[PDB]
Ligand binder design. Structure first.
Ligand SMILES: [Cl-]
Lengths: 292, 296
């Protein structure tokens, strides 16, 4: 497996729920980057160096993902709820002495990120979310068209062992097909082959796949219920926010986030749903300018 | 594989879209029975003998299912649309000299049946649909709760080869889990083990699994569009109709099925029966009685 982060160290960070793995580089104000599904921290390999010019950049594997430990789940999928993941990553950041930091997330990591901002806004100076709407909004939008487009939200959330059993027959094909399907190009050409190998190796492990299903089960149930409480309470994120999204993938995303946050700017980028790899120069530029 | 219709004949019926396999028994008015997913004609084995006491019973494998031929599909999934399946089965019935007949369908076969009644009502004396609402009605109900409870409508409709690839690793496990999960009890006890082996063997063929995926792809697209045209036009089935459904099945999930069917048909009756989604196997005496009384 290739080292795709020149000048970055490798850290295992202890928490009460298990170790969080991170690549760490740069100096200056602290910036945490959180990947999503079906990827690992290495999805930031194209943009993290530009960020590390100006920030101390911490590129973490989500709880249960990549090389992070996998806490044992339960009947409500608790450690893979975004609330729980946010609490664990707040603990990890405290181990480094970071109790107020900047945060950017993509996909599931962006879900952790806006949940973190709702639950513990004092932890964040600035927030970026990439290629997402709140989990509540996806579910509110779930008609025939959406059930077909984002079928994996219901499929991966089916009670165990249904998706686990299916995913084990040929995991390489499934993860490579998802990676390609969600890009503008519809193939693997936006990715570094070395990064695809990281994703494939992670996805090849049945325990790692079970975590992903627990993540989507949380997304269908507890995450949705947490979001619903905020909607009903009229809670809006007060942290300055940036919403970025691939125009060919979230997509009016800024209209949606304005209902969820009181200080948000945003922009589409010509890309599918893997912005930091499909449009790394654009994405890095927007993030550097926002966080500075 | 076992003979579950002892005494019944067999036919391999030619049509422009491929052969239809059927077991044929009894004597009297013609009655066609159409199975669904993930099953074959043998799911009628517990009610078919009783019906054969009063009707000429034709127990057919759906186009692409069981031992019927599997036509090559196309970009619109045409031969596995319920419109096309109904045309094909109309041809098959004509080969037998049946141009006006009674019809009962279950699950996908019931979808073929109500589409048949919408496109070609003159072909049916009476119609029974088991364990279903119209395809349009399931999609209209699509929200979070529904998407989570009936995931396979969207899963199996994903573009090929995604579900085919997933189902190929351990097909026995998936189909046996579907059969058990959709029964009242949640196990395989409602089935004759010999019938389960018919279902398992069919599902073990990748070409048969591909057909099933095409069926659900049609169900997500062309079948839905066909249904949408009829309900937006206010078209109702004029053929006298019976709707039966298992109380624990998904046709009675977020709907009162008879009220749904009254939107689609101008002369409909029906009733729930205590059962999951496999009425003719889970509640055979009750199902057989309802059908005999209705078609008589
Ligand atoms: Cl998604």
């Amino acid at each position: 497996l290739a080292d795709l982060f020149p000048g970055f160290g490798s850290e295992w960070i202890n928490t009460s729920s298990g170790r969080i793995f991170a690549r760490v580089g740069g100096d200056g104000p602290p910036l945490l980057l959180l990947h999503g599904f079906p990827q690992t921290h290495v999805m930031w390999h194209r943009v993290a160096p530009k960020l590390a010019e100006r920030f101390k950049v911490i590129v973490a594997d989500l709880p249960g993902y990549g090389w992070s430990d996998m806490p044992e789940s339960d009947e409500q999928h608790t450690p893979y709820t975004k609330r729980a993941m946010a609490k664990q990553l707040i603990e990890a950041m405290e181990q480094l002495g970071h109790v107020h930091f900047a945060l950017a997330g993509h996909d599931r990591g962006a879900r952790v990120s806006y949940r973190l901002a709702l639950d513990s806004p004092g932890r964040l100076s600035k927030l970026a979310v990439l290629d997402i709407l709140p989990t509540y909004e996806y579910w509110q939008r779930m008609n025939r068209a959406y059930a077909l487009k984002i079928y994996h939200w219901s499929f991966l959330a089916q009670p165990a062992p249904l998706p686990e059993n299916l995913l084990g027959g040929d995991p390489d094909f499934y993860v490579k097909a998802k990676l390609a399907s969600w890009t503008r190009a519809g193939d693997l050409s936006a990715f570094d082959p070395r990064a695809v190998e990281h994703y494939r190796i992670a996805f090849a492990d049945p325990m790692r796949r079970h975590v992903m299903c627990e993540d989507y089960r949380a997304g269908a149930y507890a995450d949705f219920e947490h979001d619903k409480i905020d909607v009903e309470a009229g809670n809006k994120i007060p942290v300055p926010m940036l919403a970025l999204w691939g125009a060919s993938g979230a997509q009016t995303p800024l209209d949606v986030w304005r209902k969820w946050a009181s200080d948000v700017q945003g922009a589409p980028i010509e890309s599918g749903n893997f912005l930091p790899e499909e449009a790394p120069d654009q994405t890095a530029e927007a993030l550097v300018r926002f966080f500075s």
